[PDB]
Each structure stands twice: as C-alpha cells, then as structure tokens.
Design an enzyme around this catalytic site. Structure first.
Site, PDB file in Angstrom:
ATOM      1  CG  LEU A   1       8.857  13.236 -18.408  1.00  0.00           C
ATOM      2  CD1 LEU A   1      10.301  13.383 -18.003  1.00  0.00           C
ATOM      3  CD2 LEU A   1       7.913  13.716 -17.309  1.00  0.00           C
TER       4      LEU A   1
ATOM      5  CE1 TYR B   1      12.727   7.050 -28.960  1.00  0.00           C
ATOM      6  CE2 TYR B   1      14.265   5.459 -28.019  1.00  0.00           C
ATOM      7  CZ  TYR B   1      13.276   6.421 -27.860  1.00  0.00           C
ATOM      8  OH  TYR B   1      12.840   6.757 -26.597  1.00  0.00           O
TER       9      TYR B   1
ATOM     10  CE  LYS C   1      14.268   9.921 -26.277  1.00  0.00           C
ATOM     11  NZ  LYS C   1      13.847  11.161 -25.556  1.00  0.00           N
TER      12      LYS C   1
ATOM     13  CG  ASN D   1      12.320  -0.579 -23.315  1.00  0.00           C
ATOM     14  OD1 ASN D   1      11.865   0.326 -24.034  1.00  0.00           O
ATOM     15  ND2 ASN D   1      13.066  -1.561 -23.793  1.00  0.00           N
TER      16      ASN D   1
ATOM     17  N   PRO E   1     -23.015 -20.008  17.814  1.00  0.00           N
ATOM     18  CG  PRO E   1     -24.373 -18.250  18.519  1.00  0.00           C
ATOM     19  CD  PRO E   1     -23.844 -18.914  17.282  1.00  0.00           C
ATOM     20  N   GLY E   2     -22.495 -21.897  20.820  1.00  0.00           N
ATOM     21  CA  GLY E   2     -22.589 -23.213  21.465  1.00  0.00           C
ATOM     22  C   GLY E   2     -21.681 -24.287  20.895  1.00  0.00           C
TER      23      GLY E   2
END
Ligand SMILES: [Zn+2]
Ligand SMILES: [Zn+2]
Lengths: 369, 369
Positions: B53, B103, B107, B132, B281-282
């Site tokens: 890598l 580049y 490669k 990419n 409550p209630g």
C-alpha cells in the site's frame, strides 16, 4: 350559513359532516333515507348551499315502483323552487356519465336536469364527475372493493380477486371533502373548464392487494409504508380504519437478559431503524466500534454516560446524559463506545441506527472502553 | 498466516489493520516510513501475504536524491527474493496507469516491475487499479478533497470549490478493505479479467458538497440521509468521522408546559417522524381525531392508558399500557383518542406519526374522550 347534505348517511356524507362541524361555524342539516318528508322541505327552504350526495332513487323506491318517476334530485329541486335565497348546488355525478351503461345514463340525466334547472332559476351549480372513491367509513361487503379488501385482510379472512390487472380510477375521500369545501367558499378547482377534484389515482387491483397485504404483514416485520407515494399513504390510513377495535395494539419482540432489554420498534430500508434499549442500574453495554454502522442515542429516562475512544487512540471522551434534558449523541464510525446506567432506576435509550442489524455480516468489533 | 502491510500508517493501511486484527487470527506486521531497515527485512522474510500500500518513493527520499533509484517496491521485492515461502503480493496501483501523467506512468512502472518479478519468481500477484478513495481516517488538508471538505464543514470553516462539475471516480474504504480480504482468502473479484474492487461511484464535486452541507444542516432539522443510496450512506458515515470530539451531541427542542414535554427526534419526508412525549403524573393529552394523520404509540417508561372512541359512536375502548411490556398501539383515523398517565412517575411515550406536523393545515380536531 345553512348547508344541507343529502345522502348524509353515506360514506362521503359522514366524512363531510364530521369535517364541517369541526372546521367551520356553518349549520349542517343532514338529510337521508329515513328523513321524514316535512323535515326535508324544512331543511331545503332554510338552505344557503346544497351538497347533493344522495343516490339516484328515492328512499321510498322498492319492488312496488318499477313504473313511475322516482328521481330524488327532481324532488329535491322541486322543493327548492320556494327557496327565496338562491342556494348554490353541488352535484356529485360520475365519470360514468360518458359511458352508455344505465348507471352512467342516470347520472347524465341528473346533470342535465340540474343544468336546465339552474338556467331557469339562477342557482349557481358545481357539477363534478367523480371516479370511484375510497377512504374511512366506506361500508365493507357492499359495492366497494377496497373497503371489502381492507375489512377482510385485517381479519385474516380470504379475499377473491378475479383479475389483478383491472385498473381502477380513484379519488380519496380527503380530496373529495376538501374540494367540496372549496366549492362552498366559492372557488372550485377547474381543469378543462369543469369543477374537478384533484389527485386522481389510477391503480390496478393487484397493486391494491399487494399494498394491503404489505400493510398487514408490516405489523410483524416492523416496517413502514412509503409515505411520499400519495396513494399508498392514503391507502394505509384507510386500511387502519378497518382494524377490529380490539386489535389496535401489537407486542414488540424484547430481547431480555440480566442487563435489561433490547427491542426493535420500526425498520426501514432507506432511513434506518429505531429501537429501545433498557439497562438495569449499574449496567454497561457496548464496548464495540463500527466501520460504517452509526447510531443516534437519545436517553429518555434515567441517567448515565455515553463513552468514546478512537480506535487508534488513548483519550476517553465522556458524554453525561439523562432524560431531564433531551439530547442526541451521534455515534461516529471508528470510535469504540459504551453506555452506562449511572442512576437508581432503569435507563431507557432510544437508538436510531443507519442500517439493519445482521449478525452474519455484523459490522461491530469488540474493543473495550 | 503472516501478513505484511506496507504503507501501514496510511489511510487504507490503518483501516485494513484495524479490521484484520479484529476479524481474523492472522499475525499482522505493519511497515511504514519510520520502519528501521532491519525490521523490514525481518517482516518480509516471515511473510505469507504482502499487502503493498506504500507510495512510490522511499521514506528516505528527500531533496538530496533527485538522481537515483528510490523505488520502494523494487527494494521490497528485492528483499522477498530470500523468502522461502512464495508469498502472494497485492499491489494497489491506480486507474491513472493509463493516463500519461507522471503519477500514472510511475504506477504503470510498478505494475510492470511486479508482473516481471512474478513471472520469474512464481509469487501469485493481485494487481488492482484503484480510483480515488474516501472514508474515515483519511488526513484532511492533504491531497484528499473529501476529507478536507468533511473536516472544514463540520467546523463551520469555509470551503473553496473551483468547479462543481468536476467528476470524481471513487471507491469507499470499506470496499477496498473487503476486497483485500477476498484477495487474501484467494478469491479476488474479477471484472474484465482483472482484480477489481466493486461499487465504484462517479460523483461531481457539487453533489459531494451539497450532500455534506445537508448532513451538517440535518442536525438542526432532525432529518436523515437517504440510506439506500450507497454513496450517500458511505459519505454520511465518513462525514461523521470528522466531527470534533467535543461535538458528538446536540440538544433537541423540547416543547415544555405544565403537563410535561413534547420533543421531535427524527423527521423524514417518506417514512414519517418520531417524537418523544413526556407526561407528568395525572395528565391526559390528546382528545382529538384525524382524517389521515395516524400514529404508533409506544410507552417505554411509566404506565397509563390509551383511549379510543369512533367519531360516530359511544363506545370508549381502553388500552392499558406500560414500559414493563413493550407494545405498540396504532392510532387509526376517525377515532378520537387520548393518553393518560396513571402512575406515580413521568410517563414517556415514543410516537411515530405518518406525516409532518403543520398547525396551518393541522389534520387534528378536538373531540373529548
Ligand atoms: Zn454501536
Ligand atoms: Zn393523534
């Protein structure tokens, strides 16, 4: 303003009536099959608007009268002759008025009767040609296939579909009620120079049947209708209205152990899913991270802490959190996280997650802290 | 099995490493820029699989060496000559290998070097041409526009977009890691006779920018990404990974009065919305019906009753309900309904509703009981 609704005990009438008495100050006069002759005359003479929803034959029509003028509209118009105020009249005719079947011809005779009457007496008239209708309160097992299907399916009763490819043209009752209200306030929707209820759907019986079975099975699989398809949305509501009154609830599947429970609530293929986590006092859950799965934690009762630590890192980050102040904590990918009950009562956390849980291909990795 | 990852401190390396040590029993040997020469030789000789890598130039390459063979792959292969076992080698080349920019040519020279080497020494090789990449752990402000955008946007820092129409070809890091693992187990994905990572996306910078701003603003509007668009799903996760570590939480808007509170959690245009009701409550809330709006009530803490009465009817139907047994109560249209807290503690009900709440056009009508 005095509004009379003929056919008031019908599907649309019941719907329109409930709406009008709720959303307006108008006095609503309901007339129907059982309405005594004298109170019909009484209501019509007081009237400022007539919403004429009744069927073509009079309530009195039965096997005796095969011969004779049994037109209910004719009779209604006959009475309105004495109406000093010139009330506007809305007539629900049918798209069948173009077809040469006897039902359509009946409806076309009603339109023609009303146009002639209007031209002599001055009343403004709104004549609509409605397609088939659906929505809550439509009687099942009585000439409406959608109501029948909804009623039977919700009861696990088997249905009979002859041809799935039969296409239906439909309006939803809400659009009918909204349109009638627009006509009442004096601004009908006009397409092609005629009053026209918006949002007509064209759907096969097959599509209807698949949707209804999906709504039924959705109870068990926790799924949800596609609510930006207008027909499907309207159909789902109408389906719900046919539920037996003892069957509005359904149990969820709780995963219970020593720590509390985990229970799925709703699942979608496109907007994630929501579940309920309940932790007993002193309990920590999690200590795992994900590559791509992410969550929103919302504590709604009790109190505790949500903890994070980046996988490549040492720093523990703590979010102190409770049901006294409602706040969401996102769970970012690549952070291991845990949640701990710090109180004396069960802590309940609502968790939204971006995907379905699959323990075959899990996307969760144990890592403490 | 011994696996060496060259370029281990890079984006993909960190990702692959975290996964492999979590999901497998393989011994992982990380090599990188700072790796001493002797431990490189050591790791490579022990190796059963090489995941290569690293960038094209050696860690030692700096301003001094403008002349000279500074190829890191060449050096790596040079050492593997002594490797008794014939370890398979995975090379991350680039789709630029076809283009004539320096580049790409670099490669393409790497691929060619490896093919020639394989043919002499027998190693099985998996050569990928990656586009990419994006995903968590990619360094911001350093040659990755997506990482930069995510990092800046999450911080309300302004971004610079020159041309929104620029198209990017992309793979998500998860697909890269999954593919590498497939190559490791000996079954790469083959398209057109070559190893190929699945799920490549083609997206404009403009689409990326709009999505990222949506993810940011979604915090305030309670909305959710469209999770069945794979790119959008992957992008959302990656966005979350760039959040400042102090900013994982956000307050919700509680509507508070004497009775408790009502608070929206998540809102969608196509699968309804979920909110949290808390009653003291209630307290009784509701006493209203809808034409088309419907709800699912789920009590998760405390206890009480959900009540129904058909609009045209007299029969009150009661559902006794509590957080001890988790059960959903559907709220069918045309039924007025209320919910009452019968306990000594605050009752919290999660409510899913099929549509957005709009008090202009409300679809809710007051009717007791
Ligand atoms: Zn998690
Ligand atoms: Zn409601």
């Amino acid at each position: 303003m005095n509004i009379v609704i003929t056919g008031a005990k019908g599907f649309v009438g019941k719907n329109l009536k409930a709406d009008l008495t709720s959303t307006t100050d108008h006095h609503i006069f309901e007339v129907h099959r059982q309405t005594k002759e004298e109170e019909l005359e009484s209501a019509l003479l007081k009237a400022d608007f007539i919403v004429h929803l009744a069927g073509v034959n009079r309530p009195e029509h039965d096997k005796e009268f095969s011969l004779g003028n049994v037109s209910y509209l004719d009779h209604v118009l006959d009475i309105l002759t004495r109406n000093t105020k010139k009330p506007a009249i809305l007539l629900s005719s049918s798209i069948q008025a173009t077809q040469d079947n006897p039902y359509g011809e009946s409806k076309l005779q009603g339109e023609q009767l009303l146009r002639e009457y209007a031209e002599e007496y001055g009343n403004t008239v709104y004549i609509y040609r409605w397609p088939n209708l659906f929505g809550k309160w439509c009687k099942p097992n009585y000439n409406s296939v959608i109501a029948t299907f909804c009623y039977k399916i919700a009861r696990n009763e088997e249905i009979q579909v002859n041809d799935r490819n039969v296409e239906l043209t439909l309006n939803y009752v809400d659009d009918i009620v909204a349109e009638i209200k627009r006509a009442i306030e004096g601004t009908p929707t006009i397409e092609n120079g005629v009053p026209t209820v918006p949002n007509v759907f064209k759907v096969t019986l097959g599509e209807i049947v698949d949707l209804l079975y999906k709504f039924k099975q959705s109870r068990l699989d926790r799924t949800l209708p596609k609510l930006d398809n207008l027909f499907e949305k309207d159909l789902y509501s109408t389906y719900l209205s046919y539920l037996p009154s003892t069957d509005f609830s359904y149990p969820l599947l709780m995963n219970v152990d020593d720590r509390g429970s985990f229970t799925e609530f709703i699942k979608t293929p496109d907007r994630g899913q929501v579940s309920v986590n309940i932790s007993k006092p002193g309990i920590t859950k999690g200590n795992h991270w994900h590559h791509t799965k992410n969550e929103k934690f919302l504590v709604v009762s009790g109190k505790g802490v949500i903890r994070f630590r980046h996988v490549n890192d040492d720093e523990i980050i703590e979010y102190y959190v409770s049901g006294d102040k409602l706040e969401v904590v996102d769970i970012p990918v690549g952070y291991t996280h845990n949640i701990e009950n710090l109180g004396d009562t069960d802590m309940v956390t609502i968790m939204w997650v971006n995907e379905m849980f699959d323990p075959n291909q899990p996307d969760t990795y144990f890592l403490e802290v």
